[PDB]
Amino acid sequence: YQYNMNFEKLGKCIIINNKNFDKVTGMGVRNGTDKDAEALFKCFRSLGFDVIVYNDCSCAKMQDLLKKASEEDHTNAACFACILLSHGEENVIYGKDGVTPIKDLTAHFRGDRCKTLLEKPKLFFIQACRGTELDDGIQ
Amino acid sequence: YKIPVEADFLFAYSTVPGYVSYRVPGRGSWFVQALCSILEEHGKDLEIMQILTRVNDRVARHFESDSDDPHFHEKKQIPCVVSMLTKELYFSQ
């Protein structure tokens, strides 16, 4: 009933920390995001992940980062984790140069495209907006 | 025999589809701060859905927005867990 965790490493954790954006995107500076990345780095490191932080990535850089990670040998890893910190809209996340679909980032890790993570958890943590609606709350 | 290609993914989003997500300049975002505190305390003893459900509660309860612009004043946030996991996930042993 539990995922097998008896592997040499817990696994790789990629953090993409997008703070500063090209003015053409119209998107502002995401002050507070460094404090998130630092706290995430310690936490995930502490769980046992091999954590690397990439900053202010373009759309092509984010894709290539995830593509490359999906092509590594995870045979001795229990799982994989990726954390995205950026602006976003429904189904999309911002690089510094524009938006890219979240589907395209994660699809690299499908069962058929990353056999060494087959039957292993693939975790995505996403701090980003998903639209413009506000929740007023109640009571 | 076979496994679906979309199986064994989990998406922990900071908010629900269509909605906004909050970030505090001197402190960080609601979701991440909550995620880290629950992971600091319970990362090695709770199952991941237990962890993320508590994160859901923490974001939903502890936080309420405080802005100059009245449009974004006194607002709330609920995160969103999407699970295609096929087993329980503990980060130890």
Binding site: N31, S86 | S21, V24
Partner: peptide, 4 residues
């Protein structure tokens, strides 16, 4: 508070 700001929004992402």
């Amino acid at each position: 508070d700001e929004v992402x």
